[model samples]
Target chain A: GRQSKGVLLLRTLAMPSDTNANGDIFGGWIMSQMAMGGAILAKEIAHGRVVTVAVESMNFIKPISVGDVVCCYGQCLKVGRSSIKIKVEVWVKKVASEPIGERYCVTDAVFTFVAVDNNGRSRTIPRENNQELEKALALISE
Target chain B: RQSKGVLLLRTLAMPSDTNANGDIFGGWIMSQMAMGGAILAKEIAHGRVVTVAVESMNFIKPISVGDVVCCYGQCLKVGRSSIKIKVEVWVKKVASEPIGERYCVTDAVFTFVAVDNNGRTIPRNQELEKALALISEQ
Candidate 1:
């Protein structure tokens, strides 16, 4: 069992269609999951629309397979006037692999998002406390 | 008109590609982008490749069902054994929005390393380097 860095943002199954030509789940699928899940928390903190601006240190530690339960966890690393950096960790519940019924981090990355308004322009993120923010802080502290 | 790089991958966004919130899943778009970029990388490497990193990704617009999504990418950089590609996703609204309107939805830079059959890193070839240099000149 591996420790998750932040709060769980998304949980879904790796389907047959999500696999690459090598029959393993593609790394892009995991990246998108992390971005979307991180955006969910980023939007909560920004209180509006958000868009992915940057990604850093993306490491595919291992390959993911179909039928695995993929879960994305995220920690808000930094928050700025209009941007938020969230560190995302992808952990999968593996049941069919050599290490049966194990959960481990498959890949991790830092995603930066910019809070935006309806017109798609960058906007300031409100500096208020919310349950999600509190939870992210607690995880960061841990 | 701005010129797009090599057409790497193109497919329609289907309902099965939707997220839990009902919109086309961001991850699905990312998957397509990666696969598309790898196609160009594989061509340049003249062998297998593995994704090493992603520099920056911008989600300019959201995608919807039945949209004709196209991924265009160009080789941006080539290292001793690595290749970086700038991939762009442009969608033409077919089932939802009015016809003839196409816009970019997302773009990112993906870095991939050329690998051998044993998954070991391989050096860049002159032919591939010359090919990429020509594209850059264009």
Candidate 2:
């Protein structure tokens, strides 16, 4: 029942540096943020070295623009022997009072992180018994 | 001599219909293509599906609103199922210009793969040639 819980909230601009040919925020950029958020959790949960092993169920509901603010919210889902799963949600804000709301999911993914030893090999992940772990497990089933 | 080749490109637009904040254009987006291009080469080379092992390097640069672009990419090297590649460019047009010019955007390394029928892993990918190893082994 080791349900440790926390939220990672971050904002970033859609700079001239972050656009594609047609000027929209690149899909790969958004995906990277999703990965960062998930990694943050995986590192903390595994409490040691870990690597992204899988990325699944990415839903690209919308695209970001040049000046939009991308916000990511991440949470843990499951902690297996060596893997931890996380869910991340992304939102966009107008560069100006332009607007506020989920312009798009930007995207979300189920990432699997496996704990590792110094050699980049898998290691045992201590079992979690917190209520938050229970809640996270519930999300995993969903 | 080392002559340059053409690039493989992919990109999308940020329409007024898409964002009230329509501001994220080049940097954020360029990284996306940089990552995608690397992954594309990775998949074709061996299926060594590795995560982004490095950050992107900008060249001509990312695009802006109302700017139409072409994300050009090409494979630089392919290894024992592991591919190290470079992207050519992200081209765009200036509204005042008569035509599009090629602009450098971003470059990255993406790893991907060939799995068995059972979804297992293999080192020497069947798609790879030993000759390729000579040029790419560095």
Candidate 3:
């Protein structure tokens, strides 16, 4: 249904303050964006509050510049009893610097989140009255 | 004093770091972990380094605004041109609450690769050899 690899989780412009020791966007900040993005999907699937538990890995394929348009895309890979795994990809478009519409995937990773309650304890994901889970289950099975 | 690794980063959580739920975002915490780990990784590399990957990360608790946050790093391995460090983020409320309890918020293994000014792979044996030589001399 979606055209973009997964779901559009976040879209923002990279700023100079977000630069790293390498004179580019800091890898940690990028990871933060991915986490925030993935959790948006996890919240819907789990239908409640969620917390990040694990990240399989994150690979920096390309560097992001300060003026680039950074976008985070997430794919719901699997949902175990209370855990939801999301594969997040960061794609950037060069508009503020040189090229008019140059774009590429800068980084991607698989993040895992578990549903939690008010007290920060694990909780089971709701099965009924969840549209996100239903759609993910129907589409991901194939 | 109860932190697991050596102190590498010390700062305070700001109101700007809060997410939609009015708590600090995990990304900000991980960013601290990566930057903190890279500080040690660069010291060990004795030169330029870049973050390559992160693995086995866990977010144990949420951080609050005005909390004193610290990142600790323990060097796990130093390869030919790469360094792997386990970074942990811990926080205690000073201005927001009692400053007695320090809790670990999140942790991850951050991997950094030594590189040159031009971003190419470079050997880090200089630091490695120096360590070995110092051990033998002592």
Candidate 4:
């Protein structure tokens, strides 16, 4: 019964091989999807490549079956001189027959990312020309 | 890739495994960790196991196509029926490097708990008890 936490960042179909022995989507597979989703937001906020440096809670709410349309929604929590923290939540929608439109959350977490330089070392975010993102981030931060 | 733990899984980074940024992405890398980490946890748990969580991680470098990627991890702890393994992903530059350079790409703490037939947590059998006692007797 919970609502959306942030913007929808990515969506992909869960396939057969993606399941664990329990027939549900494997935890790590769910994690991989969430990581990619959070990274997208970090990259946008940093305006370039962002390297993930940390991750938080990943409570598995329910089992996700094959054919579920997995969606990752994330948002920027805060931005530092060289790092950004993003919150990503994975929600699954049952698209297979019999339960055509059931929906629920599968996993949730926060990821830490740092902007990188040309040679790819951590660098300060280029905040000069990225006023639009900064303004949005300011609100998200507060 | 050789590191602080046993090599879990090994494969090459393919062009199909990348993004428009021309580098490998997060999901594939973590997928490898899960597959490998769970095996170690299962082996240590002496039975079925599932990854419950991954602690904070550090992704140090980017992986390129055709590079040799390997997942390595070792069980850090075994309690009741759960195990924690610190997994690391290392890449050997074979595609675009000078051919022998190697470095770690990322690492995380993956925790797994054993379960019985009904999907409930189970106690470790005596097999793990004997193994742990002998291995850690020092």
Best by lDDT: 3
How far residue A52's Cα lies from its native spot in candidate 2, in Å, is 0.6
Residue pairs clashing in model 1 are: none
lDDT of 2 by residue, B1-138 (tens): 122333455554454323334443444555555566655554464443544344445544434555654544445565444555555445466562645554545454444443443442334544345424444653
Give the top-scoring candidate (TM-score): 3
Which regions of candidate 2 deviate over 4 angstroms?
Answer: A1-6, A95-97, A100-104, A127-142, B1-138
Those runs of model 3 whose alpha carbons end farther than 4 Å from true positions after fitting are A1-4, B1-138
List the pairs of residues colliding in candidate 4: none
* Best DockQ among the predictions, by candidate number: 1
List candidate 4 segments past 4 Å from native.
Answer: B1-138
- Provide TM-scores for the models: 0.48, 0.44, 0.50, 0.49
Better of 1 and 4 by TM-score: 4
Q: Write the per-residue lDDT of candidate 2 for residues A1-142, one digit (tens) a residue.
A: 2222337546676655566788777788888888887787777667677899889778887777766777887778777878887877887766463474425456667788898999999998655554544555677677
TM-score of 1: 0.48
The CAPRI classification for model 4 reads as incorrect
Clash number for every model?
0, 44, 1, 0
Higher-ranked by DockQ: 1 or 2: 1
Error of 1 at B120 (Å): 5.6
DockQ winner between candidates 2 and 4: 2
